[PDB]
Amino acid sequence: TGIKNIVYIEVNDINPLNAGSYIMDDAPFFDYVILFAANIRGVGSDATLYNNPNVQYILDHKDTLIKPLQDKGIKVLLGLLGDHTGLGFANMNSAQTEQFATAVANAVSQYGLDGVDFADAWAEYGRNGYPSGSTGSFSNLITALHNKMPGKTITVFNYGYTSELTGVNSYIDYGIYAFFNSPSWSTGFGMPNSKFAPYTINLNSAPSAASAQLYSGQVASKGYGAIGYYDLRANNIVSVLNGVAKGAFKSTCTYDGNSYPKNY
Amino acid sequence: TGIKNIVYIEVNDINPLNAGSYIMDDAPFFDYVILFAANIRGVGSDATLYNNPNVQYILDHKDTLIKPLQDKGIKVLLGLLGDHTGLGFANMNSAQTEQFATAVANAVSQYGLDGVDFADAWAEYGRNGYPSGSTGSFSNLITALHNKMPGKTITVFNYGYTSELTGVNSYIDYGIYAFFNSPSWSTGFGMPNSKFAPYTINLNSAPSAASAQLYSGQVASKGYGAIGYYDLRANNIVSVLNGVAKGAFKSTCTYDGNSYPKNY
Ligand SMILES: CC(=O)N[C@@H]1[C@@H](O)[C@H](O[C@@H]2O[C@H](CO)[C@@H](O[C@@H]3O[C@H](CO[C@H]4O[C@H](CO[C@H]5O[C@H](CO)[C@@H](O)[C@H](O)[C@@H]5O[C@H]5O[C@H](CO)[C@@H](O)[C@H](O)[C@@H]5O)[C@@H](O)[C@H](O[C@H]5O[C@H](CO)[C@@H](O)[C@H](O)[C@@H]5O[C@H]5O[C@H](CO)[C@@H](O)[C@H](O)[C@@H]5O)[C@@H]4O)[C@@H](O)[C@H](O[C@H]4O[C@H](CO)[C@@H](O)[C@H](O)[C@@H]4O[C@H]4O[C@H](CO)[C@@H](O)[C@H](O)[C@@H]4O[C@H]4O[C@H](CO)[C@@H](O)[C@H](O)[C@@H]4O)[C@@H]3O)[C@H](O)[C@H]2NC(C)=O)[C@@H](CO)O[C@H]1O
Ligand SMILES: CC(=O)N[C@@H]1[C@@H](O)[C@H](O[C@@H]2O[C@H](CO)[C@@H](O[C@@H]3O[C@H](CO[C@H]4O[C@H](CO[C@H]5O[C@H](CO)[C@@H](O)[C@H](O)[C@@H]5O[C@H]5O[C@H](CO)[C@@H](O)[C@H](O)[C@@H]5O)[C@@H](O)[C@H](O[C@H]5O[C@H](CO)[C@@H](O)[C@H](O)[C@@H]5O[C@H]5O[C@H](CO)[C@@H](O)[C@H](O)[C@@H]5O)[C@@H]4O)[C@@H](O)[C@H](O[C@H]4O[C@H](CO)[C@@H](O)[C@H](O)[C@@H]4O[C@H]4O[C@H](CO)[C@@H](O)[C@H](O)[C@@H]4O[C@H]4O[C@H](CO)[C@@H](O)[C@H](O)[C@@H]4O)[C@@H]3O)[C@H](O)[C@H]2NC(C)=O)[C@@H](CO)O[C@H]1O
């Protein structure tokens, strides 16, 4: 397949509809949009899925804040992030793993989402009486979600206990390099180049169009399958994306004019 | 990197040591020798690696039948072939893929081999209740094996479900054109010319030396990186190989006199 553009939107600040305002070759520039993020939270022995008031609002208003992206062909994923309780993706027991995977699959079904993204950061492993080290639950969680959501996408931000995931990487559609604005010509957890983004642009502290065209052209020539983006804002950042369009796609990217505020 | 000579030996018939008897520029003429072939066999739900008595004899006698080739700098790969059970590289489920990848990696480690060659032929897909069509496992099998045996070689004979392998071709060192004694100036699964043999000689039903020199010169001048060979026997076939040496390498090939019988 062609190179996919995968964007994480910090929905505490930014209306995710802005991802749809960018066009390349009569199609959306962005292929995947990650609502960053819902949280795993340990609560006693339970492994819970927690949506903060901004995420919950977007899910509660899926017809107006998610579906128009999906109407254009964009796949919308629920981002998943640690949240300082001491329990994260990599230190659950068998019951907690099954419980968390059930919650996530039910949320993806209930809100008509296209899958999920895993970002193993900020769990603060070991706090509040949970194990301080890995139990092996991270691979089992991927496996459980693959069995529960056939046909849906799983992406992994390459940070935290991801080195453990090599054995289940056939269940993972894309991996994403964790540092911004400079490429690293490798992949994590054994992913082939065609399933990895070795270059990830911070669109808030944005690099120049010249740098984006330089590196995006190298993404294509070296045969990688994706480019990552983090923290798209509500300003028109097409200068940078047009650099990527010229570099990786031999094309151009334009703005449709729609700037969507976060009135919630 | 110069042109590599890659030879498949039908070890049901031929002692593989014969590949070491040919010399070009004070080095082995052949760079890779494939022991053709171990098999994938479905047994119930298991995906198994089966070595027939000739293959198993060679592996059990690695010090006398494999190591002398490796001492000369020749790389020796285990050939992998379907075997009429209905299960093959391209129709496994995830557990079978992991299971077969593990069995192959372990044999490569146990017998001190330099890697493997995949020939997706003779599986008879769909026999014995196995899936009749592709599951997508061929690409995952290459990924799983690359991750399990780092620093080893993977070659792919361009026959069977190989059109699926474009996404993992960075894990494949060489692809081999599947038909004999006439070049086809293209490659499979997105491979660059430098990683492909577009010309494969049958050394049993051998072409003329003049033919071999004509076509091998075109291999070099068109920028390809390998030439393939099938069914080297125990007779002195240097006349053909010297034709290739004159064509592709602007040199000569000689025989060292050693004819090794299959007394096993
Ligand atoms: C160090 C380093 O660098 N590191 C790195 C990393 O970082 C990375 O990662 C990646 O990347 C990215 C970027 O970087 C990231 O992101 C980021 O993050 C961060 C962090 O976060 C986290 O944490 C936090 C905190 O927490 C704490 O606190 C809180 C409050 O208080 C609480 O609550 C909690 O719980 C905690 O606490 C606890 O703990 C502690 C400690 O232990 C203790 O002490 C206590 O006591 C307790 O216990 C948090 O908050 C978060 O979370 C949140 O969010 C999320 C999303 O993100 C979600 O999911 C969740 O849910 C949450 O949300 C919710 O909540 C909140 C709170 O409450 C609210 O607000 C909301 O609304 C909701 O409701 C986490 O966990 C951070 O910080 C950041 O942020 C930033 O950015 C953003 C975007 O843009 C924004 O929005 C914000 O605001 C901020 O801003 C800032 O910065 C920026 C940038 O530049 C700018 O623009 C602005 O302007 C600002 O600035 C300012 O400030 C700064 C500082 O602050 C300075 O510098 C400047 O100058 C100025 O001043 C971000 O977000 C991420 O994560 C990642 N990514 C992915 C995964 O994809 C890595 C990799 O790359 O690497 C490393 O190296
Ligand atoms: C058609 C066409 O053409 N096609 C093509 C193809 O072929 C190709 O491919 C490629 O190339 C090459 C060449 O061609 C190849 O190779 C070949 O192959 C073939 C086949 O094989 C396969 O199959 C077989 C059969 O099977 C069956 O049977 C058996 C017995 O009985 C059984 O066991 C089985 O199972 C099966 O059965 C089953 O199934 C069936 C069907 O379905 C049914 O019916 C039944 O009932 C059952 O169920 C087989 O056998 C094989 O296998 C084997 O081998 C392998 C190696 O190769 C291994 O791996 C395995 O393991 C095995 O071995 C084992 O076993 C056996 C048996 O038992 C024994 O014996 C041994 O020892 C061990 O143990 C497969 O699978 C074949 O046939 C061929 O062969 C031939 O050659 C060789 C070499 O040189 C030799 O050695 C032999 O012997 C033969 O010989 C012959 O021929 C030749 C020439 O070649 C000559 O020289 C001689 O002399 C002879 O002749 C004779 O005969 C003929 C006929 O045969 C006639 O013609 C004449 O005249 C005379 O008489 C070969 O091998 C390959 O494969 C590939 N390559 C690669 C690299 O891959 C493609 C491509 O090119 O194309 C297409 O087109």
Numbering used by the authors:
A (entry chain A), B (entry chain B): 43 to 79, 80A, 81 to 201, 202A, 203 to 225, 226A, 227 to 306
Task: Give me lines lifted from the publication on this model.
To better understand the molecular mechanism by which BT1285 specifically hydrolyzes N-glycans, we solved the crystal structure of a catalytically inactive variant of BT1285 (BT1285D161A-E163A; hereafter BT1285i) in complex with the Man9GlcNAc2 substrate at 1.9 Å resolution. We found one molecule of the Man9GlcNAc2 substrate unambiguously positioned in the active site of the enzyme flanked by the following connecting regions: β1–α1 (loop 1; residues 52–57), β2–α2 (beta hairpin; residues 78-94), β4–α3 (loop 2; residues 123–135), β5–α4 (loop 3; residues 161-178), β6–β7 (loop 4; residues 199–204), β7– β8 (loop 5; residues 218–240), β8–α5 (loop 6; residues 243-250), β9–α6 (loop 7; residues 272–282). We observed no substantial conformational changes in the protein backbone for the unliganded and glycan-bound forms of BT1285 (r.m.s.d. of 0.4 Å for 271 residues). For example, Man (−5) forms hydrogen bonds with residues E166 and R169 in BT1285 while it is exposed to solvent in BT3987, and Man (−9) is exposed to the solvent in BT1285, but it is in close contact with residue N403 in BT3987, These observations are consistent with the degrees of flexibility displayed by Mannoses within the crystal structures of both ENGases bound to HM-N-glycan, as evidenced by the B-factor values. To further investigate how BT1285 specifically recognizes HM substrates at the molecular level and how it compares to other HM-processing ENGases such as BT3987, we performed an alanine scanning mutagenesis analysis of residues that decorate the β-barrel core of the enzyme and contact the Man9GlcNAc2 N-linked glycan substrate. E52A from loop 1, H126A from loop 2, and E166 from loop3 drastically reduced the hydrolytic activity against IgG of the enzyme (at 37 °C, pH 7.4). Simultaneous mutation of two non-catalytic residues, Glu52 and His126, both of which engage the N-glycan core, completely abolished BT1285 hydrolytic activity, indicating that together these two residues are essential for HM substrate recognition.
The genomes of Bacteroidales contain genes encoding glycan-degrading apparatuses that typically co-localize in discrete clusters known as polysaccharide utilization loci (PULs). B. thetaiotaomicron contains almost 300 different GHs belonging to 60 different GH families, and secretes at least six mannosyl-glycoprotein endo-β-N-acetylglucosaminidases (ENGases, endoglycosidase hereafter) that hydrolyze the chitobiose core of asparagine-linked, or N-linked, glycans (EC 3.2.1.96). Here, we discover an ENGase from the GH18 family in B. thetaiotaomicron, BT1285, encoded in a distinct PUL with its own repertoire of proteins for catabolism of the same HM N-glycan substrate as that of BT3987. Altogether, our data suggest that human gut microbes employ evolutionary strategies to express distinct ENGases in order to optimally metabolize the same N-glycan substrate in the gastroinstestinal tract.
